[PDB]
Amino acid sequence: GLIVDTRDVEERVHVMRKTKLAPTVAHGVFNPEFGPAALSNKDPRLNEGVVLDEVIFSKHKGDTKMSAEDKALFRRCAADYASRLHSVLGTANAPLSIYEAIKGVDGLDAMEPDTAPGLPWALQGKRRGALIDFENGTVGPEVEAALKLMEKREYKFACQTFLKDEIRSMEKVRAGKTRIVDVLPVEHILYTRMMIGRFCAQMHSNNGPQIGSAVGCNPDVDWQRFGTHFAQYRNVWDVDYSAFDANHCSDAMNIMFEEVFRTEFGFHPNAEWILKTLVNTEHAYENKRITVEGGMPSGCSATSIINTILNNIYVLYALRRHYEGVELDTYTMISYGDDIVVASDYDLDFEALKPHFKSLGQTITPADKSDKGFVLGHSITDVTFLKRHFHMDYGTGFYKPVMASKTLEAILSFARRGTIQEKLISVAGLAVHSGPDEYRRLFEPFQGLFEIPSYRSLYLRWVNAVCGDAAALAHH
Ligand SMILES: [Mg+2]
């Protein structure tokens, strides 16, 4: 986005500056070129001269202003996508009640009861429990008053900046490229869910190439569904964005919200309004208040879905700006936020699409970065989606999601204190698709120290998950 205003106020917003992540027994074996991000300015690992709270906001390099003709094309692509989207999902997008927003419905998980509350509740020293009863799905006096303010459309707020405690590549750790979570007030998250929660549940349930969304998918079972779909196309592209979230221009965000969340699609009018409050934001970090115009915040209860919607419209936009007679069935795509796989039977010149994405403020590069950019003739087995490859399991004939060994090694090299046993079982769920030999090697350092699930047990669990009848039949 565009930093338009920076001022200092006499009230500090304290941030988490001590890492919860610690090395495991695997760190000594795998020696990964990875580590926890910098949470302090005076981290000894940082390049001696880097200022942490200048790199974390360096992503804000402006807010691209689109011309009239480009805006008119964007609205047309947004409307056509909304058309396809609501054709599949339906028009049952009536507001969720206070109770349903807290407890969640079928397709939407409950609100997290213990996570960060937001502002100004963090200054009052109040946890999420003091504001909202998560047991009974009711609200206290504080949230109640704010929800009434959101109905009148007079509610203003601040975003709280947290440093993301996570594993990052040593080059990024050393360069101070720590990511940030923009924690929004708990009432905003609740009300956003109230306004578009029903829509979000439907998008999770109906995920796939038809709506262009993988939000709500389980890669274990859905990789077969996705793989066989993209295997039928002549050309497949692996597209990468740089700073996808921050580079959403105000024009693109406003027009999208207007075209997708219309009342005629079954939405409450306030659905559009609450999403538009994400466009111009104020961010609180220590003594500094930074006003940003444009870009998506990280902590909205629908960032993945909003990002995914924009991604779909960007592809439609860029192709229509370059070629004539381009429709939704000219190509096919799956998206999860910034992550994207595109396919077509047409020889689409994606290299030529670069400045067309630039008119939206977005920069595209091929994932498997090779000489002279994007190339034709790539298939589904060549690409990466959600950090997973599309490999054929030769025992069943189904596509399996395979993560790279370096990534698995990195994930296994660090954990929060006391969570190791739970993390191991979870990562084993991902490591099973790498095969018996790699699986065994990856969990070698943990043997005798923790319970490691047998490859056999997890393989059989998977076969039934993807196709019950197959595992039923495999007993012929
Ligand atoms: Mg990718």
TrEMBL record:
Source organism superkingdom: Viruses
Cellular location(s): Host cytoplasmic vesicle membrane; Host endoplasmic reticulum membrane; Host nucleus; Virion
Binding positions (UMP): 179, 245, 307
Subunit structure: Interacts with RNA-dependent RNA polymerase; this interaction allows 3B-1 to binds 2 polymerases and act as a primer. It also allows the recruitment of the RNA-dependent RNA polymerase to host membranes.
Function statement: Forms an icosahedral capsid of pseudo T=3 symmetry with capsid proteins VP0 and VP3. The capsid is composed of 60 copies of each capsid protein organized in the form of twelve pentamers and encloses the viral positive strand RNA genome. Upon acidifcation in the endosome, dissociates into pentamers. RNA-directed RNA polymerase 3D-POL replicates genomic and antigenomic RNA by recognizing replications specific signals. Covalently attaches UMP to a tyrosine of VPg, which is used to prime RNA synthesis. The positive stranded RNA genome is first replicated at virus induced membranous vesicles, creating a dsRNA genomic replication form. This dsRNA is then used as template to synthesize positive stranded RNA genomes. ss(+)RNA genomes are either translated, replicated or encapsidated.
Family per similarity comment: Belongs to the picornaviruses polyprotein family.
Official protein name in the record: Genome polyprotein
